Design a protein around this ligand. Structure first.
Ligand SMILES: Cc1cc2nc3c(=O)[nH]c(=O)nc-3n(C[C@H](O)[C@H](O)[C@H](O)COP(=O)(O)O)c2cc1C
Ligand SMILES: O=C(CC1CCCCC1)Nc1cccnc1
Length: 359
C-alpha cells in the first residue's frame, strides 16, 4: 500500500475526522508559503557525481554533539493523540528504534515525563514556548533537564497564532478525552470545556497563555536559566540569526513554522543559504518546512544544514498505524536519502557539498 510520504498523507485524509486533518494540514491565510515550502525544493536542481564508490553509504551524523543515525529528526507537532491513541508515546518509541531524535512540543498530549518513560534511550529535546507565566515556563525547562532531554528549541515566531482559516471555520479544539498534559489548570491544558471564544480555540488559547511581549531580553533570561543547548526556532533573517549567536545560543532552526504563522514568507530552503552565511560556522543550522523526500534532505545538507526536521509526515504515520506508522515514515525517508546520496556519489554526510545543487 503506502510507499512514499505523499501516500501517508492521502491515507490520513481518508481516516481522520475533517477538523483534525485540517488542523494538521493547514497553513496560514491563503497558504502561499505552504505551497512554496514544497515547490522551492523542486527549483533546486541536483548535479550528481558518478563513479565515486557508494557500496557503503554512512547516513550518520551529530546534532548538538549527540550522534544520530541520519540527518532526519522529528519536529514538534502539537497534540499528537488526535492522530492516534498513543500519540507522542508512539512517536518517541519509533525514534528510539530508528536512532534519531524527537523534538517534543510544549503543547503535547503527553507529559515530558511520560515521553521520557516511553523512550528512555531515545534522543529527546523540548520545544519551548515562553508563557506569560514564567514560573510555568521555568517548570517545563526544569522537567526537561530532570528527565534527560538534551536541548531546548525555543520558538520565536509565535507571539500570536497565525490565522489558519479552516481552524476558524471548524472552531478547532481538542477532542473531549484529551488535554495538553504539561499543565494543570483548565485553561493552560487547553480543556475543550473552557471558553476559548467563537473562532479557532487554539488562537484564543495562545492569546490567553503565550506572551506577545517577548524580546531578546527573554532570550537572555532563558540563556541564564539553563545550561542545556538552546536553538532558536523560527528565524528567517540573517540579522536575527547573528543576534541569536550574540546571545550565546547554540543553533538556528530555519523555519516558517510549517507555513502556519506569517503567510508570504519565503520557503525555508530558499532562506537557508543566507542564514548559513550569517552565522559564519559559529553554530549549527537546521531546516524544517516541506521535507517529504530523500532528495529534499540532500539539498538541505548541500546548502549547509546539519540536519532537517519533519513535522506533518510524522502525524500522517501516526494516523496510519501509531508507532509502526511513524517507524515506516522514518524508514522511507532514510531509504530515499540513502538512495539519493548513492546516486549523487556521496559516501557519507561530510562529502555532501555545495556543488551538488544549483538554482
Ligand atoms: C500540526 C502541526 C503542529 C505543530 N505544532 C507545533 C508546536 O507545538 N510547536 C512548535 O514550535 N512548532 C509547531 N509546529 C511547527 C513544526 O515544528 C515544524 O516547524 C513544521 O511542521 C515543519 O514543516 P512540515 O510540516 O512541512 O514538515 C507544528 C506544525 C504542524 C503542522
Ligand atoms: O549566560 C550566558 C552563558 C550561557 C550559560 C549557560 C550555558 C551556555 C551559555 N551568556 C550570556 C547571557 C546573556 C547575555 N550574553 C551572554
Amino acid at each position: 500500500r503506502l510507499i512514499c510520504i505523499n501516500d501517508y498523507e492521502q491515507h490520513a485524509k481518508s481516516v481522520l475526522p475533517k477538523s483534525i486533518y485540517d488542523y494538521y494540514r493547514s497553513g496560514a491565510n491563503d497558504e502561499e508559503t505552504l505551497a512554496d515550502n514544497i515547490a522551492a525544493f523542486s527549483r533546486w536542481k541536483l548535479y550528481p557525481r558518478m563513479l565515486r564508490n557508494v557500496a557503503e553509504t554512512d547516513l550518520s551524523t551529530s546534532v548538538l554533539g549527540q550522534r544520530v543515525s541520519m540527518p532526519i529528526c522529528v519536529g514538534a507537532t502539537a497534540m499528537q493523540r488526535m492522530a492516534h491513541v498513543d500519540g507522542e508515546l508512539a512517536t518517541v518509541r519509533a525514534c528510539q528504534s530508528l536512532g534519531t531524535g524527537m523534538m517534543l512540543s510544549s503543547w503535547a498530549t503527553s507529559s515530558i515525563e511520560e515521553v521520557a518513560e516511553a523512550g528512555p534511550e531515545a534522543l529527546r529535546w523540548l520545544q519551548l514556548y515562553i508563557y506569560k507565566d514564567r514560573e510555568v515556563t521555568k517548570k517545563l525547562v526544569r522537567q526537561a533537564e530532570k528527565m534527560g532531554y538534551k536541548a531546548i528549541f525555543v520558538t520565536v515566531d509565535t507571539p500570536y497564532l497565525g490565522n489558519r482559516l479552516d481552524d476558524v471555520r471548524n472552531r478547532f479544539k481538542l477532542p473531549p478525552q484529551l488535554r495538553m498534559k504539561n499543565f494543570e489548570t483548565s485553561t493552560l491544558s487547553f480543556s475543550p470545556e473552557e471558553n476559548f471564544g467563537d473562532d479557532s480555540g487554539l488562537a484564543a488559547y495562545v492569546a490567553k497563555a503565550i506572551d506577545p511581549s517577548i524580546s531578546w531580553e527573554d532570550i537572555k533570561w532563558l540563556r541564564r536559566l539553563t545550561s542545556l543547548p538552546i536553538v532558536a526556532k523560527g528565524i528567517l533573517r540573517g540579522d536575527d540569526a547573528r543576534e541569536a549567536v550574540k546571545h550565546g545560543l547554540n543553533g538556528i532552526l530555519v523555519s516558517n513554522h510549517g507555513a502556519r504563522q506569517l503567510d508570504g514568507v519565503p520557503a525555508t530552503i530558499d532562506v537557508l543559504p543566507e542564514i548559513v552565511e550569517a552565522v559564519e560556522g559559529k553554530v549549527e543550522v537546521f531546516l524544517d518546512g516541506g521535507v517529504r523526500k530523500g532528495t529534499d534532505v540532500l539539498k538541505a545538507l548541500a546548502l549547509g544544514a546539519k540536519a532537517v526536521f519533519v513535522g506533518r509526515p510524522i502525524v500522517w504515520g501516526l494516523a496510519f498505524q501509531g508507532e509502526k506508522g511513524v517507524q515506516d515514515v522514518l524508514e522511507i525517508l532514510k531509504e530515499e536519502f540513502r538512495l539519493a546520496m548513492a546516486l549523487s556519489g556521496c559516501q557519507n554526510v561530510k562529502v555532501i557539498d555545495k556543488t551538488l545543487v544549483r538554482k
